Design an enzyme around this catalytic site. Structure first.
Site, PDB file in Angstrom:
ATOM      1  N   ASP A 152       0.005  -7.481   1.987  1.00  0.00           N
ATOM      2  CA  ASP A 152       0.465  -6.082   1.919  1.00  0.00           C
ATOM      3  C   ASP A 152       1.988  -6.100   2.054  1.00  0.00           C
ATOM      4  O   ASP A 152       2.579  -5.737   3.054  1.00  0.00           O
ATOM      5  CB  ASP A 152      -0.201  -5.275   3.009  1.00  0.00           C
ATOM      6  N   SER A 160       3.921   3.184   7.890  1.00  0.00           N
ATOM      7  CA  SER A 160       3.596   2.074   6.955  1.00  0.00           C
ATOM      8  C   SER A 160       4.783   1.660   6.171  1.00  0.00           C
ATOM      9  O   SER A 160       5.566   2.472   5.697  1.00  0.00           O
ATOM     10  CB  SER A 160       2.507   2.558   6.021  1.00  0.00           C
ATOM     11  N   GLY A 161       4.860   0.319   5.952  1.00  0.00           N
ATOM     12  CA  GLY A 161       5.971  -0.230   5.225  1.00  0.00           C
ATOM     13  C   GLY A 161       7.193  -0.537   6.044  1.00  0.00           C
ATOM     14  O   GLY A 161       8.070  -1.283   5.564  1.00  0.00           O
ATOM     15  N   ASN A 211      17.583  12.072  11.290  1.00  0.00           N
ATOM     16  CA  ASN A 211      16.691  13.157  10.987  1.00  0.00           C
ATOM     17  C   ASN A 211      16.420  13.215   9.482  1.00  0.00           C
ATOM     18  O   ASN A 211      17.351  13.450   8.707  1.00  0.00           O
ATOM     19  CB  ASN A 211      17.337  14.472  11.474  1.00  0.00           C
ATOM     20  N   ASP A 229       1.553   2.554  19.687  1.00  0.00           N
ATOM     21  CA  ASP A 229       1.217   1.879  18.397  1.00  0.00           C
ATOM     22  C   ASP A 229       2.070   2.482  17.327  1.00  0.00           C
ATOM     23  O   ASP A 229       2.674   3.566  17.480  1.00  0.00           O
ATOM     24  CB  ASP A 229      -0.279   2.142  18.083  1.00  0.00           C
ATOM     25  N   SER A 230       2.099   1.844  16.133  1.00  0.00           N
ATOM     26  CA  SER A 230       2.569   2.559  14.939  1.00  0.00           C
ATOM     27  C   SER A 230       1.391   3.342  14.376  1.00  0.00           C
ATOM     28  O   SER A 230       0.252   3.313  14.879  1.00  0.00           O
ATOM     29  CB  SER A 230       3.173   1.583  13.935  1.00  0.00           C
ATOM     30  N   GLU A 262      19.430   7.091   7.546  1.00  0.00           N
ATOM     31  CA  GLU A 262      18.761   8.316   8.054  1.00  0.00           C
ATOM     32  C   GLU A 262      18.566   8.267   9.551  1.00  0.00           C
ATOM     33  O   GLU A 262      18.177   7.241  10.099  1.00  0.00           O
ATOM     34  CB  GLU A 262      17.356   8.427   7.466  1.00  0.00           C
ATOM     35  N   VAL A 284      17.348  16.718   7.788  1.00  0.00           N
ATOM     36  CA  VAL A 284      18.709  17.285   7.825  1.00  0.00           C
ATOM     37  C   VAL A 284      19.640  16.257   7.212  1.00  0.00           C
ATOM     38  O   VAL A 284      19.617  15.083   7.680  1.00  0.00           O
ATOM     39  CB  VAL A 284      19.120  17.546   9.341  1.00  0.00           C
ATOM     40  N   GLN A 319       0.131   6.396  10.846  1.00  0.00           N
ATOM     41  CA  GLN A 319       0.376   6.880   9.488  1.00  0.00           C
ATOM     42  C   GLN A 319       1.765   7.378   9.312  1.00  0.00           C
ATOM     43  O   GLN A 319       2.279   8.120  10.151  1.00  0.00           O
ATOM     44  CB  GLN A 319      -0.607   8.109   9.264  1.00  0.00           C
ATOM     45  N   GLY A 320       2.392   7.001   8.221  1.00  0.00           N
ATOM     46  CA  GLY A 320       3.752   7.401   7.913  1.00  0.00           C
ATOM     47  C   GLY A 320       4.769   6.352   8.396  1.00  0.00           C
ATOM     48  O   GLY A 320       5.904   6.395   7.932  1.00  0.00           O
ATOM     49  N   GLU A 336      23.921   9.285   5.354  1.00  0.00           N
ATOM     50  CA  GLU A 336      22.893   8.826   4.421  1.00  0.00           C
ATOM     51  C   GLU A 336      23.485   8.224   3.131  1.00  0.00           C
ATOM     52  O   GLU A 336      24.545   8.629   2.663  1.00  0.00           O
ATOM     53  CB  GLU A 336      21.973   9.957   4.015  1.00  0.00           C
ATOM     54  N   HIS A 349       0.809  -1.216   0.000  1.00  0.00           N
ATOM     55  CA  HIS A 349       0.000   0.000   0.000  1.00  0.00           C
ATOM     56  C   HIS A 349       0.844   1.269   0.000  1.00  0.00           C
ATOM     57  O   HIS A 349       0.310   2.341  -0.224  1.00  0.00           O
ATOM     58  CB  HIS A 349      -1.057   0.004   1.094  1.00  0.00           C
TER      59      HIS A 349
HETATM   60 CA   LIG Z   1      19.124  12.886   7.311  1.00  0.00          CA
END
Ligand SMILES: [Ca+2]
Length: 223
Positions: free
Chosen positions: A84, A177-178, A54, A171-172, A52, A57, A174-175, A62, A40
């Site tokens: 899913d 996901s995955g 932050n 909980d987890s 990553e 920034v 929105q955002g 990264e 999804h």
């Molecule tokens: Ca960063």
């Protein structure tokens, strides 16, 4: 993640952020060339961001690698979120190091009661909205199948498990996901869905990755 903690920079080195001009979902690095996420979270034009902390920034650890291919599960059903799961191939292999590392796929499915680590950059409020910049973490236990089915009657397949706290508050969301659910050092779940976030009697529902290891291995053997 609602009710979690700041993980600490690069302490979850297999966590990725999927970016299409902005962070929109998490994922898990499973080898130098492949990420597992939720179907999804499919978008065209995905850049995978590894190392990553932050997400707003550039801190120096990264790696930003375009996806070359995304492969939604062949039986994904976006209505029920059964199956899913998605694979994302990187255009170039990540350089694996102490901050960018793969997570093992499971041999066996995890046990009810196991405390797992869920992480992500999703919303941190149950009521309202606030998105963190730095990666958040949560320890949550896997719930029994019968408890999960009682929470979501007629909605839980054998390819889903619940994890979390039926009293609410953690909980987890929105955002997230995955992103990963890691139990005993293996990727056992993918953040998939739930009714709201951190609500009473409405734990998180996660894709059961141990049912997909044959598909993942044959897909990566072929692409
Ligand atoms: Ca960063």
């Amino acid at each position: 993640i609602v009710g979690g903690y700041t993980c600490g920079a690069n302490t979850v080195p297999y966590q990725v952020s999927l970016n299409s001009g902005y962070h929109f979902c998490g994922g898990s690095l499973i080898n130098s060339q492949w990420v597992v996420s939720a179907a999804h979270c499919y978008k065209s034009g995905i850049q995978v961001r590894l190392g990553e902390d932050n997400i707003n920034v550039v801190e120096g650890n990264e790696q930003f690698i375009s996806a070359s291919k995304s492969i939604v599960h062949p039986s994904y059903n976006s209505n029920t979120l059964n199956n899913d799961i998605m694979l994302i191939k990187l255009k170039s292999a990540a350089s694996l190091n102490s901050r960018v590392a793969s997570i093992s796929l499971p041999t066996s499915c995890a046990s009810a009661g196991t405390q797992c680590l869920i992480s992500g950059w999703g919303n941190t409020k149950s009521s309202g909205t606030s998105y963190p910049d730095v990666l958040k973490c949560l320890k949550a236990p896997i719930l029994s199948d019968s408890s999960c089915k009682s929470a979501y009657p007629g909605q839980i397949t054998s390819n889903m498990f619940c994890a979390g706290y039926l009293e609410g508050g953690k909980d987890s969301c929105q955002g997230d996901s995955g992103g990963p659910v890691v139990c005993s050092g293996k990727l056992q779940g993918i953040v998939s869905w739930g009714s709201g976030c951190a609500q009473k009697n409405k734990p998180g529902v996660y894709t059961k990755v141990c049912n997909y290891v044959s598909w993942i291995k044959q897909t990566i053997a072929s692409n």
